[PDB]
Design a protein around this motif. Structure first.
Motif, PDB file in Angstrom:
ATOM      1  N   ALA A 193       0.885  -1.131   0.000  1.00  0.00           N
ATOM      2  CA  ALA A 193       0.000   0.000   0.000  1.00  0.00           C
ATOM      3  C   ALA A 193       0.939   1.200   0.000  1.00  0.00           C
ATOM      4  O   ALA A 193       1.935   1.197   0.720  1.00  0.00           O
ATOM      5  CB  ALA A 193      -0.850  -0.020   1.250  1.00  0.00           C
ATOM      6  N   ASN A 194       0.715   2.143  -0.916  1.00  0.00           N
ATOM      7  CA  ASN A 194       1.522   3.371  -0.966  1.00  0.00           C
ATOM      8  C   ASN A 194       0.983   4.498  -0.065  1.00  0.00           C
ATOM      9  O   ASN A 194       1.751   5.218   0.578  1.00  0.00           O
ATOM     10  CB  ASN A 194       1.671   3.935  -2.388  1.00  0.00           C
ATOM     11  CG  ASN A 194       0.901   3.165  -3.414  1.00  0.00           C
ATOM     12  OD1 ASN A 194       1.485   2.386  -4.171  1.00  0.00           O
ATOM     13  ND2 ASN A 194      -0.410   3.407  -3.498  1.00  0.00           N
ATOM     14  N   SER A 195      -0.343   4.619   0.018  1.00  0.00           N
ATOM     15  CA  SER A 195      -1.037   5.654   0.812  1.00  0.00           C
ATOM     16  C   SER A 195      -0.855   5.642   2.318  1.00  0.00           C
ATOM     17  O   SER A 195      -1.398   6.475   3.021  1.00  0.00           O
ATOM     18  CB  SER A 195      -2.546   5.644   0.491  1.00  0.00           C
ATOM     19  OG  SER A 195      -3.013   4.331   0.192  1.00  0.00           O
ATOM     20  N   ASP A 196      -0.042   4.711   2.774  1.00  0.00           N
ATOM     21  CA  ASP A 196       0.291   4.467   4.164  1.00  0.00           C
ATOM     22  C   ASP A 196      -0.038   5.423   5.340  1.00  0.00           C
ATOM     23  O   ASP A 196      -1.093   6.037   5.386  1.00  0.00           O
ATOM     24  CB  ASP A 196       1.759   4.131   4.246  1.00  0.00           C
ATOM     25  CG  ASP A 196       2.193   3.081   3.264  1.00  0.00           C
ATOM     26  OD1 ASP A 196       2.124   1.880   3.630  1.00  0.00           O
ATOM     27  OD2 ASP A 196       2.668   3.463   2.160  1.00  0.00           O
TER      28      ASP A 196
ATOM     29  N   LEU B 155      -7.649   3.345   0.225  1.00  0.00           N
ATOM     30  CA  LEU B 155      -6.477   2.527   0.452  1.00  0.00           C
ATOM     31  C   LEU B 155      -6.213   1.870  -0.871  1.00  0.00           C
ATOM     32  O   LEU B 155      -7.145   1.398  -1.509  1.00  0.00           O
ATOM     33  CB  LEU B 155      -6.799   1.461   1.485  1.00  0.00           C
ATOM     34  CG  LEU B 155      -5.827   0.288   1.585  1.00  0.00           C
ATOM     35  CD1 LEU B 155      -4.526   0.732   2.249  1.00  0.00           C
ATOM     36  CD2 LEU B 155      -6.499  -0.845   2.351  1.00  0.00           C
ATOM     37  N   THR B 156      -4.943   1.825  -1.271  1.00  0.00           N
ATOM     38  CA  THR B 156      -4.530   1.227  -2.549  1.00  0.00           C
ATOM     39  C   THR B 156      -3.523   0.077  -2.379  1.00  0.00           C
ATOM     40  O   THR B 156      -2.566   0.191  -1.607  1.00  0.00           O
ATOM     41  CB  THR B 156      -3.981   2.323  -3.545  1.00  0.00           C
ATOM     42  OG1 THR B 156      -2.677   1.961  -4.002  1.00  0.00           O
ATOM     43  CG2 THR B 156      -3.851   3.674  -2.880  1.00  0.00           C
TER      44      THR B 156
ATOM     45  N   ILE C   9      -1.156  -7.554   5.567  1.00  0.00           N
ATOM     46  CA  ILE C   9      -0.990  -6.124   5.643  1.00  0.00           C
ATOM     47  C   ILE C   9      -1.898  -5.613   6.759  1.00  0.00           C
ATOM     48  O   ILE C   9      -2.970  -6.172   6.990  1.00  0.00           O
ATOM     49  CB  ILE C   9      -1.342  -5.473   4.314  1.00  0.00           C
ATOM     50  CG1 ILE C   9      -0.598  -4.153   4.170  1.00  0.00           C
ATOM     51  CG2 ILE C   9      -2.825  -5.265   4.198  1.00  0.00           C
ATOM     52  CD1 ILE C   9       0.887  -4.333   4.041  1.00  0.00           C
ATOM     53  N   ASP C  10      -1.457  -4.582   7.470  1.00  0.00           N
ATOM     54  CA  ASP C  10      -2.227  -4.016   8.572  1.00  0.00           C
ATOM     55  C   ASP C  10      -2.827  -2.701   8.135  1.00  0.00           C
ATOM     56  O   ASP C  10      -2.129  -1.888   7.528  1.00  0.00           O
ATOM     57  CB  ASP C  10      -1.306  -3.783   9.756  1.00  0.00           C
ATOM     58  CG  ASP C  10      -0.717  -5.065  10.284  1.00  0.00           C
ATOM     59  OD1 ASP C  10      -0.186  -5.859   9.477  1.00  0.00           O
ATOM     60  OD2 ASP C  10      -0.789  -5.291  11.511  1.00  0.00           O
TER      61      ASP C  10
ATOM     62  N   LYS D 207      -1.430  12.236   8.438  1.00  0.00           N
ATOM     63  CA  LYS D 207      -1.970  12.159   7.077  1.00  0.00           C
ATOM     64  C   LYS D 207      -3.492  12.247   7.264  1.00  0.00           C
ATOM     65  O   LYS D 207      -4.207  11.238   7.171  1.00  0.00           O
ATOM     66  CB  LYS D 207      -1.541  10.853   6.398  1.00  0.00           C
ATOM     67  CG  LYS D 207      -0.790  11.090   5.082  1.00  0.00           C
ATOM     68  CD  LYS D 207      -1.239  10.158   3.952  1.00  0.00           C
ATOM     69  CE  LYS D 207      -0.366  10.277   2.697  1.00  0.00           C
ATOM     70  NZ  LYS D 207      -0.768   9.354   1.626  1.00  0.00           N
ATOM     71  N   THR D 208      -3.870  13.477   7.550  1.00  0.00           N
ATOM     72  CA  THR D 208      -5.234  13.911   7.901  1.00  0.00           C
ATOM     73  C   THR D 208      -6.373  13.157   7.207  1.00  0.00           C
ATOM     74  O   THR D 208      -6.147  12.150   6.518  1.00  0.00           O
ATOM     75  CB  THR D 208      -5.439  15.387   7.555  1.00  0.00           C
ATOM     76  OG1 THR D 208      -5.784  15.524   6.185  1.00  0.00           O
ATOM     77  CG2 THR D 208      -4.196  16.241   7.805  1.00  0.00           C
ATOM     78  N   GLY D 209      -7.510  13.767   7.490  1.00  0.00           N
ATOM     79  CA  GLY D 209      -8.871  13.384   7.097  1.00  0.00           C
ATOM     80  C   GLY D 209      -9.769  14.049   8.141  1.00  0.00           C
ATOM     81  O   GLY D 209      -9.282  14.617   9.129  1.00  0.00           O
TER      82      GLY D 209
END
Length: 363
Positions: free
Chosen positions: A102-105, A114-115, A172-173, A279-281
């Motif tokens: 996953a790059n978007s970590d 999530l990718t 993956i977590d 890495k907000t939201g």
């Protein structure tokens, strides 16, 4: 032939034995006829090959026939067909590695997709079935991404890289920061000290959070009314703002938007938006307040329910003793000419009693 899969940086063991079982010559060479590692008695040797100092064989297991190949720190480019030329025969083994990622970590809050892209030997094809920690057998191609993450998808997934009649699992977590409620709702009456509560799920992290609650008071379009708060660990504090009513807030993480007295004008909807980071939201969770006011004019009475009421509900006023003094479907009913009794105003829907406010009559 032997098609074994492996994980990047992980390791893998290539088998190789034969009958005779005694410590005999053997030599692992890739399809390029280059010698990975070989032997000469107890003295284990390797080759000039790029694989060199990451390959190894178990000398102990050597005595028992195995002339095993152990590849450490698996380089993606290790994907090849290796041969174990033992005592008069050849073993063909293709080791195809893979690497789910996953790059978007780091620090994923809600929604923010999530990718999952995959690494694989140039020429082979994988398929990924990402089983979630809870449900959804989400699957895709050399890539599959989870849409907008909803709380419950927090945890440890288990994507599987299928290739051949073989398959390699991946752990993956994925933890979704974010609320444990959609539309909270409180039914109170002109006076009752209102309380509100929106919880999270513990977490730590550095310089991380603050937002505010917005309110749409009923009729009083007089918006922009709010309260602002900053958070850090189990520490919360009002940035500023509040004004209007005396809303008090806690010093402690389990947030309690307190409303001193449930006055009638404080009824309506509201959105409590939380937004932290790394890495907000921004989280959201709805809030609503209803009020009931049972008050006899003079020798005659009335009661009314303000706020977010349903066009399905009913209101009723009776003196408790006897049945329905007035039943109806609205927020401002009246009962002209009451008799002595400790009257009850009732707000509901379907059947179960929502709001109940008692009051007495004199003569």
């Amino acid at each position: 032939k032997k098609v074994v899969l492996g994980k990047k940086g992980d390791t893998v063991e290539l088998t190789c034995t034969a009958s005779q079982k005694k410590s005999i010559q053997f030599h692992w060479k890739n399809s390029n006829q280059i010698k990975i590692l070989g032997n000469q008695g107890s003295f284990l040797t390797k080759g000039p090959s790029k694989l060199n100092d990451r390959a190894d064989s178990r000398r102990s297991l050597w005595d028992q026939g195995n002339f095993p190949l152990i590849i450490k720190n698996l380089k993606i480019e290790d994907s090849d067909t290796y041969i174990c030329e033992v005592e008069d025969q050849k073993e063909e083994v293709q080791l195809l590695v893979f690497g789910l990622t996953a790059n978007s970590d780091t620090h994923l809050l809600q929604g923010q997709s999530l990718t999952l892209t995959l690494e694989s030997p140039p020429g082979s094809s994988p398929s990924v079935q990402c089983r979630s920690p809870r449900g959804k057998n989400i699957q895709g191609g050399k890539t599959l991404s989870v849409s907008q993450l909803e709380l419950q998808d927090s945890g440890t997934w288990t994507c599987t890289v299928l290739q051949n009649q073989k398959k390699v699992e991946f752990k993956i977590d994925i933890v979704v920061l974010a609320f444990q409620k959609a539309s909270s709702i409180v039914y109170k009456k002109e006076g009752e000290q209102v309380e509100f509560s929106f919880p999270l799920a513990f977490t730590v992290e550095k310089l991380t959070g603050s937002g505010e609650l917005w309110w749409q008071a009923e009729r009083a379009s007089s918006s922009k009314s709010w309260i602002t708060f900053d958070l850090k660990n189990k520490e919360v504090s009002v940035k500023r703002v509040t004004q209007d009513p005396k809303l008090q807030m806690g010093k402690k993480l389990p947030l309690h938007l307190t409303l001193p007295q449930a006055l009638p004008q404080y009824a309506g909807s509201g959105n409590l938006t939380l937004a932290l980071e790394a890495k907000t939201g921004k989280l959201h969770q709805e809030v609503n307040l209803v009020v009931m006011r049972a008050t006899q004019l003079q020798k005659n009475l009335t009661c009314e329910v303000w706020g977010p009421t349903s066009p399905k509900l009913m209101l009723s006023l009776k003196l408790e003793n006897k049945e329905a003094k007035v039943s109806k479907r609205e927020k401002a009913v009246w009962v002209l000419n009451p008799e002595a009794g400790m009257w009850q105003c009732l707000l509901s829907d379907s059947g179960q009693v929502l709001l109940e406010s008692n009051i007495k009559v004199l003569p």
